[PDB]
Amino acid sequence: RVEKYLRRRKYSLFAAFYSATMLQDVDDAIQFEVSIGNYGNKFDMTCL
């Protein structure tokens, strides 16, 4: 009765980055990584 409650749907997320300021002590180039749960993590994937 619990297994039959299992379902999956495709969700859509969009994010845009307009600006970034007030940085301190920057030694190298900056990149950001954003993920949802266990999805979108660049170290847990080979191709997305």
Binding site: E3, K4, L6, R7, R8
Partner: protein, 97 residues
Amino acid sequence: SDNYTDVNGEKVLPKDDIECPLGWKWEDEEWSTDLNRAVDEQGWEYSITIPPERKPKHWVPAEKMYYTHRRRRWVRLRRRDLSQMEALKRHRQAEAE
């Protein structure tokens, strides 16, 4: 079309190729999804690649990457003319041939 079976795993025709017997009318022209079973919301149950016996023993409502087969039970009803069942014994004499 070869994935339609009876309870014993024997091949049967696709659900949409089923016609009503003489003396009977369909109560349901289309097959209903059986949600009365241990199946997901789509009526599907899942299982592991069918074992060497070719007679799979376990199915679950859950979908897993382990499961390579999926099954549904369909329900369809028919009703007989309210007269005599003498007609029902006319097409049941040929049990085997």
